[PDB]
Every structure is written in structure tokens, then in C-alpha cells.
Amino acid sequence: GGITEAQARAIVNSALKLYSQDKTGMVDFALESGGGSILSTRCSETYETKTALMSLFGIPLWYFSQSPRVVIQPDIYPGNCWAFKGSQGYLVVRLSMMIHPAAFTLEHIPKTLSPTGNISSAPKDFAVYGLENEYQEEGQLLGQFTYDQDGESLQMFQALKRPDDTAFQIVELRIFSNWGHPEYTCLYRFRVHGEPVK
Amino acid sequence: GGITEAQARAIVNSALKLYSQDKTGMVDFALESGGGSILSTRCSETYETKTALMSLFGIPLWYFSQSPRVVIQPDIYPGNCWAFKGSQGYLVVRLSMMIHPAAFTLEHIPKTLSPTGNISSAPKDFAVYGLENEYQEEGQLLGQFTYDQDGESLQMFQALKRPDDTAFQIVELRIFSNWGHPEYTCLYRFRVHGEPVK
Amino acid sequence: GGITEAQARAIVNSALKLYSQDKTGMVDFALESGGGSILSTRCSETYETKTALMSLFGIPLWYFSQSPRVVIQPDIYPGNCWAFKGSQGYLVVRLSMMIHPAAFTLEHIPKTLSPTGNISSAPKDFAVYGLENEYQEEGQLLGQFTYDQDGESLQMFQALKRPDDTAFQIVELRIFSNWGHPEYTCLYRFRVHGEPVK
Amino acid sequence: GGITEAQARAIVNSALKLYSQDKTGMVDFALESGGGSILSTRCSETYETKTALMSLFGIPLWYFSQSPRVVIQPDIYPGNCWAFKGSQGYLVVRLSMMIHPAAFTLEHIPKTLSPTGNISSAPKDFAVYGLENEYQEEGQLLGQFTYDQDGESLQMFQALKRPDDTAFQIVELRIFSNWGHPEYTCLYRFRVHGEPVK
Amino acid sequence: GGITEAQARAIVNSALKLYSQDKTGMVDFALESGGGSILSTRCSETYETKTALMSLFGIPLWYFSQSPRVVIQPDIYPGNCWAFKGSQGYLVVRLSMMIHPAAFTLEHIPKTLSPTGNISSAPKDFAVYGLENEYQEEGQLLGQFTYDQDGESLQMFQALKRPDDTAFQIVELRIFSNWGHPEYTCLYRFRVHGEPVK
Amino acid sequence: GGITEAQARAIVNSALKLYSQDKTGMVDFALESGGGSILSTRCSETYETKTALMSLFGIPLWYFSQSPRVVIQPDIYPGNCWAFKGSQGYLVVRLSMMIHPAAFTLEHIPKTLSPTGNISSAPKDFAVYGLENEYQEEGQLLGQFTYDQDGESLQMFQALKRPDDTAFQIVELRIFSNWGHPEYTCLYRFRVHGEPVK
Amino acid sequence: EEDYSCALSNNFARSFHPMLRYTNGPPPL
Amino acid sequence: EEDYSCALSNNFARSFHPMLRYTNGPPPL
Amino acid sequence: EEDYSCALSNNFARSFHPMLRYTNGPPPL
Amino acid sequence: EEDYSCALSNNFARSFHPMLRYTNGPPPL
Amino acid sequence: EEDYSCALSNNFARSFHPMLRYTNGPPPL
Amino acid sequence: EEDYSCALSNNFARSFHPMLRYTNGPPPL
Ligand SMILES: [K+]
Ligand SMILES: [K+]
Ligand SMILES: [K+]
Ligand SMILES: [K+]
Ligand SMILES: [K+]
Ligand SMILES: [K+]
């Protein structure tokens, strides 16, 4: 019933190898360094706090706030997230290749690293759509989901299966609710997985 | 006496989960991206080496040296540290929230990654104080400690316990000695842990 | 024959400690933050794609491509690599200290994170040389090697042993072939290991 | 019948004194340094030639063309003029004070300083209007005039007299034709004269 | 008693030759392009109006106000002057050569070019001093004078004669009163004349 | 024998009209604002004095020296000149139009405005050549001349007459000697006159 | 109509030429 | 209607955050 | 005394390293 | 006293107007 | 020879003084 | 020959990528 030292070493080494491969071992076709980009935020309003002041020699220069581009960058230390006003938001992403989308990942910080002890700014209900071109107003539904505030930091979601599989190079993420924060919603990272067209 | 494969997998997965949470699984109220900031270095002198020259088309542009802000940023590759002249230094940090401080973390690179084989620039004796406002000259002692050059890279230190627990949003780190480097002392990362006031 | 829970915990903790030390637990004398630098690319031509456009208010500003300096920086997410035209390339690196070189490391992304499923842009045959000064045209051979596209992401290579061990502070990496990409070759990270002269 | 040396000196000195007072001895309420400004050019199109290239170290930086603001600046060396496409143009000017407008000045270079020997780009038929606010589409006519290509460089024009004199702080210059240039029309300087409201 | 055409032409040509030589035909040792500079304004306060806004694409960039350096530059169109708050002001000028100062010039715009019809912002009572070094608080008096608002635009003033003539390369202009403007005093140009030490 | 007041006024007004037309009443095909440009200075060395320091907040920013372009700009206040080392210099100018060159103008400041009382930096012997293209090393001689230090500020020089008149759009000015300054030679303005090809 | 659209426009405001506007007060002179 | 105006908008494109767009080709990797 | 002057000083504020100060509110997270 | 403080000051040196100082030599002319 | 090298050179083109070149057309005037 | 010209060249030094060179001393670490 019990394992040997050699077998324990193999299990440890295999787990660290997967960890080192962006945690998942799967291509992220939204990743900015790999060819993904942010096209649009529609009518979303980036939350303007006016608290992060950059200065030199005592001279005020600029107020700093995070860009929507941080959602397709891998750092997820607290605060490395895009914040929009209210709890409804929109993000249009161009993928690095034309693919058949099969799954999506959403990450948020865990409660143990949040200074208040809660993650009420995290997204709750959301959906993903496939678009044929940047200017399409309503795309094809790829799935509707809920990010669970009592789950793990990284959560994965499976796309709907249809008898005809259409390929897309643009997707739209829509956030419909958050976990109760009354001023804003924060998005740390969104990933898109699937199979490239041959 | 022996463990099963299922039990070994659970131990591995739990260790990687803690590792991914900033190694410790505890909020760092000094972290810059999360709301902390560097207010002052008092009379400390940043070490001026004049060796890192930035150029374009062969035209010299700027000499590069690290900012005190790197002490509240998480990268700790060799050289990603703040260096001050001599072995006495001062750093005044504003926390992201008002808290009851309970513990502090100090990190330095390990000897195996230092090109000389020693870490003589690391801090040795130090203390932490709580301040009521930025312009206070002498704060309340929260503890005095020694970073052990023969210990682990990341070391944690417990604050003094008093019958009345006062809350602070500003702390001061004072370094009194180093591990023998004759020109400078290098600080890689300093963290502050505790419980936020309700 | 079987291991205890205490023994399994010790194996896991030892593996994460090595992982945290730049994966290898060995000094990298080429690392830029630690004192290494890129001196020259000889006649190599950085691949000019003209696809990554930076803009503001709809106004085009700049086309972005990666610098040769990224080869001595630790991020290896897809795209964080230096690309040169064809499959022959040159990189002259100044080390942080004068050393007796003993081994070299080359990293590339794994196939599971490459959008096409192949890594045909990876380097194949290469060699390393020691130079006495920046302007030397032909150095002393330290070894000739092949990066294996069916191996692990990180691969290590042992320098030639000679009866007289000469010290160097400049090395040259020469790439002679790639794994079949018809337009370019991509280099993610190159490291240099050894013993500093006393 | 003849004049003395003293009388000749007085005539010369009086002529140079008037010359030194902006040639005319009258306030120009459109002058930029004195408080005038350019608000708008309506649908006028600045002529885009793409011939004046600024470079440094052989690197192209910027194409230079003159701003509409040059029309209320006093330098009138050849080329120090605003050029618009075709022969219909619009310029909305805010005066330094609220005034009763009484006269206008238009300047162009003389033929003796034009390299071709003609000034076919000069304005011909034009009119001036008074506006109550910046967003008014049609103002009150203050006069219609023709710049004479066979006259002097500096020409002055008298505003219409009406039984009720209205004050204005915004005027609009409309150019309806030029002296035959087939690609553009060039304006060197426009001035506005009158009496400030008390 | 009467003059000939040849004699009249000679008088005209001689007057234009003097006019072209900076109006006076005398070296100005304060002129910036010729080697003069502004060292200090002591406790003078440049008048902050916050009315001249520079923008691009509708984005506010900078508020413009004139520098003390304009006092040693030759353009004197309305508004090309240094304005300080109140009616007491100080200007410390370093001359292009060490000289025996013999005379000073002050210019203001004439009333015919001022939009209000008055020049109440012009300086009235003033004095000039010679200083041995930049940090001297009280220099040697070279003369005290009044700019006459009913005189010519350009006025000249003779330095005091003493039995021992000391040389200076720094002078200080002190303004004690103006012609009645209640908010500021405007200085268009100040010149210094004399003989260089051999 | 004597003139009337009307005749004296006509002579004065005619002289001021010519004065206002760039002093000469003739097109300058080298003028920068009108389409001329500086192509090259060959092996001339701009005189590096390192005395004109620009600063902000006490921080040194830049040393200022005049560009060769100032030679085709009309301001000739003292110091608004191009200075080259020694007394041999070269300037290659592209004209605004293809012309038959007929005359050249050279200006220097007069002695009465020079602080030393001499103009020993002025050019003395010089020649002008016509070039067919920018890269021609030796052009066709258009004339050889001497600027007279005892003459007027502005001096004009007539091109050689040949039986066949060739047109040029590039000219080269060569300076062979100065009026004795031991360190440099200063050029204030150079003009080119003639008839454009039809 | 073309006449109505021209009044709407302000091409100088959408150019690379910087604007200088006096916000309701003459500068010192 | 509000639903129709939101599709029209793109607030990120009119912000001070610089945009990075790949013009129809993946970068080298 | 030296001990009293050090408290007065703030060399980071007079350096070429830009400062980032949170004006009394944590950023979104 | 006010008279003694004014001599100490130099407001131009702490402004946003750039300074131009000739370091002991006239420029070419 | 020195005479041949001078023709080759163009020190203005390798200086910190910006160049302004009219690419085959006079500007509007 | 091509082999001799390549040694002469340094395309990185004539690019728009800024260079960082340590002038004979390791930085603090
Ligand atoms: K992120
Ligand atoms: K750090
Ligand atoms: K890399
Ligand atoms: K003008
Ligand atoms: K002035
Ligand atoms: K000039």
C-alpha cells in the first residue's frame, strides 16, 4: 500500500514541472506577450481613484491607475488588476491565432492575501462570446459561468458543445455581477484555451 | 507507518498552494502594488557606483541605480535590492491599512546564488518602530532582531507583546550593522504582517 | 521499503527550495541584474516583423520588438525571446566576474505552451567561446552542443576539460542551425556557470 | 519754398518713430503676444506638402508646416504664413479686449521678395464678421473688401458704419478667392483696430 | 538756407544706419545673445495669472508666463515683458565683460500701442548698483532715476561720476514704484553701456 | 536748387520702403523660411566653448551653441552667428529654386556693437562655387571676394560673367581667412541672388 | 448640406499644432 | 437606447493608457 | 548634533528616483 | 527682518523658467 | 591626403544640431 | 570576404534598443 522514496520524488518533480508551465500546461491564446491584445472596453469606465500620485523633487507629475491590458499579463500580486466602476463590465480580446475555443480560465487573489479578509470585488456571474469582427455588437454565446468566491484562486470553465464547431479569433468577456463591493469590480487575469485551425 | 500515493499527492499539492501565495500565505501590508509606499530614507545615502551606463547609438544617457522602492517589490533576483553607504540605514514605510502589527519578514539572496560565495552585504542587527505621523523623530519600539547569514533566505520575526496594543499605519526600519561588507549594505525585501483595525 | 509522512514532507520542501533558487541553485554570471551585459550581436539581424504597433488616442507611435538583452533576463513566457533572421546568429556577453567557466544553460518554452504545438524556432546546434577582449574575432572553443527539441525546457551543457584552465570575463554564443523554422530563430535565456578567480 | 536741414531732420525722425510702432501707430487687438488667440479654422484644410523634414543623426523625426497662429505673429519673411488648400478659408479670432471695431489690416509679401516674381497665393476677395460667442455660425457683417495685388504690402480697410455700434470680442475672417494659385492660399498677417469699451 | 536732394538723401541714409544698429549705435553689455545673463530676482514674485493655457487635442498641458530672461532680449511687442507682483522688484544681471559703466537704457511700449491707452504698469522710480560678486547684498550706487511716462519709448540715463572709477561685471536693477497699476509692474528691456577694461 | 517738403517726404518714405524689404529689395534664394537649407559643413568643426549652460532647479541640462542653420536666418544681433574653429570653413547650401546666380550678400555686425571694438572674427577672403549635386567635391567657380572690415555691415558681391550661363540649385561657400581672431571665425548671414529658370 | 457641416467643424483643434487660449484675461503688458 | 450606445463606445481607445495591437501576425516565439 | 540632523533629512525626496505616494486611500484590489 | 531675508532669496532659481548662465567666457561673436 | 578626406566628411550631419531639409519642393509662400 | 566583415559589425549598437554596459564593476548585490 505504501510508496517508495523513488516514487515520491517522481510525484514531486512532476507537480513542479506542471507548475512551471503557467500552472496549467495549456496554451493561453489571449496572453499579450504571445500575440493577444485588448481591442475595446465598450462603455466600461475605469475606476478613477486619484490616490496614486507620482512625483519628482516634490513636483506632482501623474496619477497612476492600471490599464485593461493587465488582464492578459501573468503577474497577480494584489493590485495588479483592472478595476471598473460598478458591477457590469466588457472586455474585447483578439486571440493570437484563429482557434476552436474549448475552455476559459479566470484568476483572482485568494482571501488570505487580501488585506480586508474578503474578496468582494471579485467577479461573480459572467459569460463569453465569439465575434466574427471587431465591430460586431452581439456575438455567439460560448458559455455562462460563476466565479466561486469560496473556491481556489485559479478556476477553469468548459465551453458549450454544439454540433457545428465555429472558429473565432475575437472573444468578448461580459461581467454581470460581483461579490458585493459597492464601488468597483477587479479583474486579475483571463485566459482562453483551445485548438488552432489547421 | 508508511504513506499512500493519494496522501503523498495531497502533501505536494498543499505545499505548492502555499508557495504560490507569496510563499507565506499572509497579507503583506507594506507591498507597493497593494497600497504601501516609501515615505523617507532620513539621512541614508544611496550607494553611488557610476558603473551601470545606459546609452543609445553610442551616446551616454544615464547612470542606473536601484530605488528604495525596490524593497517593497517582490522580485529578488541578485541585484534587485536597495544599497546604501556604510552599515547604518533608515527606511520609513506607510502601510496600506491601519493595523496591529504582529510580525515582520526580511529576505536576502542565498549564498549559492551570490557570485562571491558570501552575503557579507546582508543586514545583521536591526529594529522596527511604530510612528504616529510621518514627521515623528522617535517611534515606539516593536522589536529588535538579527538576520542570520547561516539561515534560510526568508526569515520571520515576532513583534513584542504589550498589555495595550496600539495600532499604526507608519513603521520605520533601522539597520544597525551588516555581515561585514566594507562599502555598503543591500536590502532585498521587507514585509509587515498583522490584523487590520475594525 | 515505504516512506513516512515526515520523510515525504522533507523531500517536497527540499525540491521547492531548489526551485526557488533560479531552478538550479547555481550562480548565473551572465544575468543582467547581477552584473552581466550584452556587448554585441556581430552581423546578426533582429527579425523585423512590423506587427506590434503602440498607439495613443489612435495615433501610431512606435513598433515594438524584443531586444537582445532579453536573453539575460529571467522571464520566459511565450514571446519573451530575441528573434534573429535565418538560422545563424551571434551574441557576445560580458560576465559579472572573471571566472573559470564550467557549464552553460539554455532554455526554450515547452511545446505544450507553443500555440502551433511545435518549437521549430528553437536553436539546435551551437557552440560557446572564450574571448580575451571585446574586439577579438575568434576565441577559444569551450564546447559544441545540440539543444534537444524532445528534451526538457531547461538543458545544461558541460564545458570541455583541458590540462590548463584559462579564465575569461567575455564569452560568445554562436548558433549554427534551428529546428526548422524558415524565417527566424528565437532565444529565450542563456546562462554561464563556473568558479570565480581568487 | 525750400526746407531747412532742421526741418528735414524732423521729418525723417517722425517717420522712423511711426515705423518703429508696428508701422501704423495703432493698437492691434488680434496680436497674440498682447492677448489675442486663434479659436478655430472651421472646415479649412491646412496644406500638407510633406517636404520640410526634420532629422537628427540621419533619423527622420517630423514634418514641419506652419500653424494658423502665425497669422497673429509679426514676422512676415517669405514662408512665415498659414497656407490652406484651395481658395476658400476661415479663421475665428478672439480679441484681447471687447471693442467697437473700426478698421482691419492685411499684409502679404511684396512681389520683389517672391521667388517667382508673382504673389498668386495672396488673398483677393474677403469679408470680416462680428460674433457674440465662439459657437455662432453666422455673425454680423463688418465689411467686404479686396486685397490688391498691385498695391503696397500692408493694406488697411475701414469697417461699415451703422447707426447702432455693437461691441465684439470675437471676429471671423472669411477668404473667398485668391490671385490665381491653383493649389493653396497663404495668409501672412491679419490685424484688428478700434476703441475699447469703457 | 535750403538743402539739396543729395543732402536730404544723406540725412535719411544716416538715420536708417543708426536705427539698424540696435537704435543707439552703442554696445549693450547686458544683451543675452552677446554674453549677458540673469543671475537672480531676489524675493521678487513673478505675476501668476493662470490665463495662457497651452493645449493639444483639447488636453491642457501647461500655463505660459514670461521669464525674467525676456528683459535682456530685443523684442518689445506688447506682452514681451517680465511682470512681477506689486511695485517693488529686483533683477541681478551678469555683464558679458568687465567694464566701467557709463549709462543705462530702459524701454517700455508707447501708449499708442497699449490697448487701454495708458502704460500704468511701467516702472517709475528705480536705481542701479554695482556688485563685486553674486552673493553681495548691497552694492555701490551707480545712479537713481525716473522713467517718464510722458516721454519717448526708449530713455537713456547717465551714471554718477566719481573721482575713482571702479569696474564691475555684475549690476543690480531695483524698481521702487510704478505708474499706478494696482496688481503688477512690467519690464520690457534694460541695457548697460560703458567701456571695457583693457 | 532746394527741395520742397513734399519732395523730402517722398525720399524718406521710399527709403523706409526699401529698408522694410529685407534691406535690399531682392529675393534671397538661400533664406531658410523661403525654401533654402544647409546640406553640409564638410570637415568644418563648430567651435566648442562649453560656457553656455542651461539648467533647471539648479540641475545642469545642456550646453548651448549656435547651429550652422543660423547663417540663413535673418536675426543678426551679436552672437547670432555660426562659429567654426580656425580660419578655413565650408558651407553647402541648397537653394529654394534652380537659378542663374548673379550676386551674393555677406553680413557681419558693425564694430560699434562689438564689445571689444573690433570684428577680428569676421570673414576676410572667400569664394562661391556652383555644384550639380550634393556629393560633388569641386564645383564651378562663381567668384572670389574679400569682406572689408572697414566697410558697411552689409556688403554685396557680383558673380563672374561667362559666355555660357549655367543654372544651379546648390552652392558652396568657402572661407579662406579671417580678420585675425586666433581661435575662430563667425558667420552672421549669407544670401544668394539671381534669376529663376523658366 | 455642406454649408451646415463646415460650421460644425474645427480642424485646427484636431491637428498637431498646439493651441494657446487666453482664459478670459489679457496677459500682463 | 442605452444598450445601443454601449456597443458604439470604446472608452479604452480615448484614455491615457497606451494601446498595443498586433496587425494580423503573431510575434516571434 | 548629528542625531538631530538625520531626523530632519529625507535624501530620497531630493534624488532622481521618482516617488509614489498613496494619498490616504488603498488602490483597487 | 524682511530686508535681510530678501537678499537671501532667489525665486527665479526655484521656478519652471530655465536658466542660461555663461560660465566665465563670452560666446563667439 | 587631407584634401580628399574633407570632401568625404559632413560634421553637421553627425552633430546634435537638428537638420531641416526640403525634399524637392519649396514650401508655401 | 563575408566571414571577415561579420566580425567587424555590431548591429545591436546601431539599433533603437538601448544598451546597458557595466563599466568594470559589478553592481551592489
Ligand atoms: K494581471
Ligand atoms: K526587491
Ligand atoms: K528571457
Ligand atoms: K506672420
Ligand atoms: K523684451
Ligand atoms: K543669423
Numbering used by the authors:
A (entry chain A), B (entry chain A), C (entry chain A), D (entry chain A), E (entry chain A), F (entry chain A): 615 to 812
G (entry chain B), H (entry chain B), I (entry chain B), J (entry chain B), K (entry chain B), L (entry chain B): 8769 to 8797
From the paper:
The nuclear envelope partitions nuclear components from the cytoskeleton, thereby necessitating their mechanical coupling across the nuclear envelope to enable cytoskeletal function in the structure and positioning of nuclear contents. This is achieved by the Linker of Nucleoskeleton and Cytoskeleton (LINC) complex, which traverses the nuclear envelope and binds to cytoskeletal and nuclear structures to mediate force transduction between these partitioned components (Haque et al., 2006; Crisp et al., 2006; Lee and Burke, 2018; Meinke and Schirmer, 2015). The LINC complex is formed of SUN (Sad1 and UNC84 homology) domain and KASH (Klarsicht, ANC-1, and Syne homology) domain proteins, which interact immediately below the outer nuclear membrane, through complex formation between their C-terminal eponymous SUN and KASH domains. Thus, the LINC complex axis is established by a peri-nuclear SUN-KASH core interaction and mechanically couples the cytoskeleton and nuclear contents. We find that SUN-KASH complexes between SUN proteins and Nesprin-4, KASH5 and Nesprin-1 are 6:6 structures formed of constitutive interactions between two 3:3 complexes.
The SUN1-KASH1 structure was solved at 1.82 Å resolution and demonstrated a similar 6:6 head-to-head assembly, albeit with less extensive interface-spanning interactions provided solely by opposing KASH-lids. The electron density indicated the presence of a molecule bound close to the 6:6 interface, which we interpreted as a disordered HEPES molecule from the crystallisation condition. This likely provided structural rigidity that underlies the high resolution of the dataset, but was not essential for the structure as we solved numerous other datasets at lower resolution in which an identical 6:6 interface was present in absence of a bound molecule (data not shown). Importantly, the SUN1-KASH1 structure closely matches the previous SUN2-KASH1/2 structures, in which similar 6:6 interfaces were present in the crystal lattice but were thought to be crystal contacts. The SUN1-KASH1 6:6 complex is formed solely of a tripod of KASH-lid tip-to-tip interactions mediated by amino acids I673 and F671, in the same manner and owing to the same torsional rotation as in the SUN1-KASH5 structure. KASH1 undergoes acute angulation away from the 6:6 interface, as previously observed in SUN2-KASH1/2. As such, whilst amino acid F8784 binds to the KASH-lids of each tip-to-tip interaction site, KASH1’s N-terminus does not contribute to the 6:6 interface. This creates an open interface, with large solvent channels between opposing 3:3 complexes. We consistently obtained models that closely fitted experimental data (χ2 = 1.56) in which 3:3 complexes interact head-to-head with a bend of approximately 60° relative to the crystal structure.
